[PDB]
């Protein structure tokens, strides 16, 4: 806190509570007793525990009929109207689309649909697998996610 | 039919002005005007102007007969205190409150 280290008044004789710094956290405008510093909130997750959790989540996404596996999922041109149309036909709104290699067109189409996310198999996080209503994996992607988790 | 007049931020502590207001609370306006006229207090001057204004308000705004008016409600609220430094002996300071009051008078035929 900005200020001098001058004792505000003498130790004895004034009839006031003894004071040492105008920056005392007891004082208005004083320091914060245990002032925050920037923190790293990152935790270590064991590799095996991370992979464990992915296997548990995917296994649940099958049991609750949320992992809708297809063979080929793309659009013709990079147009949001096309993917929106494809998703209303396939009959889902909120969905995570895991494809083998990330097709530029499907990436761009999805980008402006807030309920829709489009990732490559390398890019599956556990929160997204749980957050989305339905997960659409391409057969190609399931092979990679299998190979990836063993 | 009630009519109101306030003097807000009147220079005078409520305590001082309340001594005068207690004299005319419930009186006929004529009876009260007289009482105030022969009350040797600064506050009597203050309260007579607000009672005069209330009567005027009740004649001009509402079609009320001055002969029928009584002082129904009168009260004085503490106003903002103006704070001043008064120098005392040995270089010590006191803080003087110049106490203001809000004077409200309600006249009515009831």
């Amino acid at each position: 806190v900005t200020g001098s280290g001058k004792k505000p008044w003498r130790q004895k004789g004034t009839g006031r509570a003894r004071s040492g710094s105008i920056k005392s956290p007891i004082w208005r405008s004083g320091g914060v007793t245990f002032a925050a510093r920037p923190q790293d909130h990152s935790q270590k997750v064991n590799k095996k525990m991370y992979r464990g959790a992915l296997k548990s989540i995917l296994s649940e996404l099958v049991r609750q009929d949320r992992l809708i596996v297809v063979e080929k999922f793309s659009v013709e041109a990079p147009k949001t109207k096309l993917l929106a149309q494809k998703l209303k036909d396939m009959a889902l709104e909120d969905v995570l689309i895991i494809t083998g290699e990330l097709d530029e067109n499907l990436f761009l189409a999805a980008r402006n649909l807030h309920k829709v996310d489009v990732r490559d198999a390398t890019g599956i996080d556990p929160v997204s697998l749980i957050a989305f209503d339905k997960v659409v994996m391409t057969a190609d992607a399931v092979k990679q996610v299998e190979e990836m988790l063993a | 039919m009630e009519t109101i007049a306030k003097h807000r931020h009147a220079r005078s502590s409520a305590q001082k002005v309340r001594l005068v207001a207690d004299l005319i609370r419930g009186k006929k306006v004529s009876q009260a005007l007289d009482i105030l006229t022969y009350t040797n207090k600064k506050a009597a001057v203050l309260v007579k102007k607000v009672l005069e204004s209330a009567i005027a308000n009740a004649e001009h705004n509402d079609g009320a007969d001055i002969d029928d008016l009584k002082v129904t409600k009168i009260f004085v609220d503490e106003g903002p205190s103006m704070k001043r430094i008064m120098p005392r002996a040995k270089g010590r300071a006191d803080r003087i409150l110049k106490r203001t009051s809000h004077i409200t008078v309600v006249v009515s035929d009831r």
Partner: peptide, 19 residues
Amino acid sequence: GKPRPYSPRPTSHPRPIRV
């Protein structure tokens, strides 16, 4: 709140000496 206290001013009487 409280004003900053005064530096020592002159005293009318000595403190009685218990000693």
